[PDB]
Amino acid sequence: LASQCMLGVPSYRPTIVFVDIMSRLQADEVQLHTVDLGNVHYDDNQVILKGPKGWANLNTKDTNVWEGDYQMVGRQGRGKADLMKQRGENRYTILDNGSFTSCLPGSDTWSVVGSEIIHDREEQVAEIWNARFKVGPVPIFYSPYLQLPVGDKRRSGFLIPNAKYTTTNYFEFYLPYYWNIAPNMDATITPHYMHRRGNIMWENEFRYLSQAGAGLMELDYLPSDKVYEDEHPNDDSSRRWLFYWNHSGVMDQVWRFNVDYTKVSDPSYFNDFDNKYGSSTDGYATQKFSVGYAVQNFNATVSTKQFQVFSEQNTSSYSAEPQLDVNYYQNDVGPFDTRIYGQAVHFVNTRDDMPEATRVHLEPTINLPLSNNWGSINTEAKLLATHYQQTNLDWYNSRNTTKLDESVNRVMPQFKVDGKMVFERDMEMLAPGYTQTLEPRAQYLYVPYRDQSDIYNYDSSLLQSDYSGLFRDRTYGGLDRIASANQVTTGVTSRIYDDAAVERFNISVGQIYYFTESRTGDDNITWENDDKTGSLVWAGDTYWRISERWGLRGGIQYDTRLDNVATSNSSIEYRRDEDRLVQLNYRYASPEYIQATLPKYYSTAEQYKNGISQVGAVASWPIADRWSIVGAYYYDTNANKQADSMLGVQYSSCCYAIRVGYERKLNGWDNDKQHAVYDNAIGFNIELRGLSSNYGLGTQEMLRSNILPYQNTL
C-alpha cells in the first residue's frame, strides 16, 4: 500500500516577450520585465502548480497563479484555488477560496475547503479560515478556523474522536484534546461521554521523560454515576475514579527508579469501565514504589508493596511497608565465589486486628564451580538466618490452637550440588551435517526441618514446578515458609542443530525424587494422595522451530500427589509478516491443582472449581492489499462455553483508514442464577492518511485489544 500511494506522488532535476525557464517555469507565452500566459506549469522541491495565468518576481521568488490546480512533490497532498500564491521565500503556499486533500488524483474521498488556506512548510501546518470539511460532495463540518498538521511535528489541539457501543454503557464517545507541553513531556485530556450513566468521565493522561527515567500518569474522574447510584444508594456520592502512575529508569548507570501504581474508587471500576491499564480480568490493583542503587559487585533497594483487593470474600491484605533488599558479590575468593543476600521488612495489614511483624533475613552463600568442555559441577552452601518480631497477636491467638510467638529465630544450613554433562552425535538420518546434543543434569539438595507454625505467612505462595522449576532450591516464593529438602532432581535435555549450527529443536524431561517428606510444620495441604516420598513431581518442555515461519511449543507438569496432570500448555504458530499469522494454543490446569494451590472456597465455587481447559485460536491476514482481518476465539472445553471472542476489520487507503472492532468477553457472574455474565463491545475508529509518516495495516494493535491478548510464540 505505501508503494501504491507513492506511485500517485510526483518526484523532483539537480535561463530562458517569449517556453522553459529556470525552481522551473513553463508556458505558451512569457512577458519579462518580474514575469507574466497559457499552459502555465511551475515546479520546485515541494510543489507543482498549473493554470491559465501566472506571475512571479525573480529577485524575491514571490509568485501568483490564477484559477489553478496544485500537487505536492515527495508528499501526498493536492487541490485547487481561485488565486494560489507563494510568499516568504517559499515558506508559505497560500490559497484564496482554496481546497486541500491527501487523496491521489481523481479519487476525491475527502477534502477541506476554505475562504483562505495557508500551507506553512517550516511549521508543518495547513491553516484554514471558514473551513468546510467534505466527504465526497457533502460538507460534514464547519468552523471559523481549522488547522491540519501536514507533517510529523507534534502540535496541541483535538485528535480525531472515536466511538463505541457497549452493553455496559450503551453509546460511548471520546474527544481527545492533546497538549504539546514540551519536547520531553505532554498531556491528553479526553472527555468520555457514556449514554447509560448520562455524564462525562474526564480522562487525563500525562507523559514525561527525565534524567530519572520515563513515565506515564493517568487520572480518570466521573463526578457522579446514575448506574452505580442505583446499585449502591447508601454512599455520600457516586464519584468513580482511577489514578495510575508508571515510572521506570536508570540514572547515572547506578540509581534505579520504578513506580507501578494503580488506585480505583471501588471494587467494580474495571468491570464497568474498559481502560488502558487495568482489566476486568484482575482481582486487585497493585501499588508499588522502589528506589535502588546498583554497581558491579553490590546493590541495595528500598521499596513499598501495597495491594487494593476487590473481592469481598476476604478483606485482609498484607503490605510490605517498607522492604529493603541488599546484595553483595565477591568472586575469586581463592577458588570460591561468594555472595551475601540481606533483607529487612515491616508487614502491615488493611484489618486493624490481623498480626503485624518486622522481619530481618541474612543469607551468606559460598560456592565452588568446576568446569570442562563436556560438563560441569557446582557446589553451594548457605545459612538461611531469619529473625521476626510479631505484634497484634491477641485476636489470632484467641481463634487458633497453634499460636503465633512475639519473637522468632530460624537458622538453617542449605547444601546443594548441581552437576551437568553434554554429549554430541553426528546425524545421517535427518540431513547431512546435522548434529544432536544430549544434556543430563542431576542436583542434590539438603535443607533441614524447622517448625515455622509460630510465624504467620505474610509473603510465601507455593511455587509452580515447570522444567526449570525442577532445579529451584525453594518450594515457596517468600521467606515465611521454607520447606525441608532431601531430594535428587534428575533431568535430560536433547537438542538438534542444523548444518549452520542453529538450534532447530529441543525437548526436556525431568523429575524430583524426595528421600523425606518436604515439611514446613504449617503444611495443611489438601492433596489427593498421602504420598510423601519417591518420584513425586514430573515436568517436561519442548520447542520446535519447524521453519523460519512455523513454530511449536509445549509444556506438561504431572504430580503423583494429585494422581493427574497438574497443568499443561501447548501452541503451534505460523507467522510470515506482522500482518500474516495463525496461532493455535491450549491451556490446562486440573481440578486437583486448583484444590491444592488456591483458596479453599475455589474448590466449592462453580466459577473456579473445574480448573482450566481452554482452546484458543488467533489469526491475522491481509485480504487484497487494503483489508486487514484480525480475529481471536477462546473456548472453555469443560463448560462448552466461550471465554473471549474478538474480530477486527480495518480498511486501509492512501487518503484514510477505518477500523471496526468487536469483542465479547466474560465480565462477572450472577449470584442469583449461577451463570456467567458477558459484555459485548463494538468500536469504530477513523483516521486521515498521507499527511504524516503512517501507512501501517493495524493488525498488531487489534491482536492485543482483548482480555486474552496475543503473544508471538515463534
Binding site: 481549522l146 510529523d152 502540535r155 483535538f158 485528535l159 480525531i160 505532554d186
Partner: peptide, 10 residues
Amino acid sequence: CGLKGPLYFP
C-alpha cells in the same frame, strides 16, 4: 487539530 508522537530530550 493536534498531532501526538514520541517524547524526546530537548
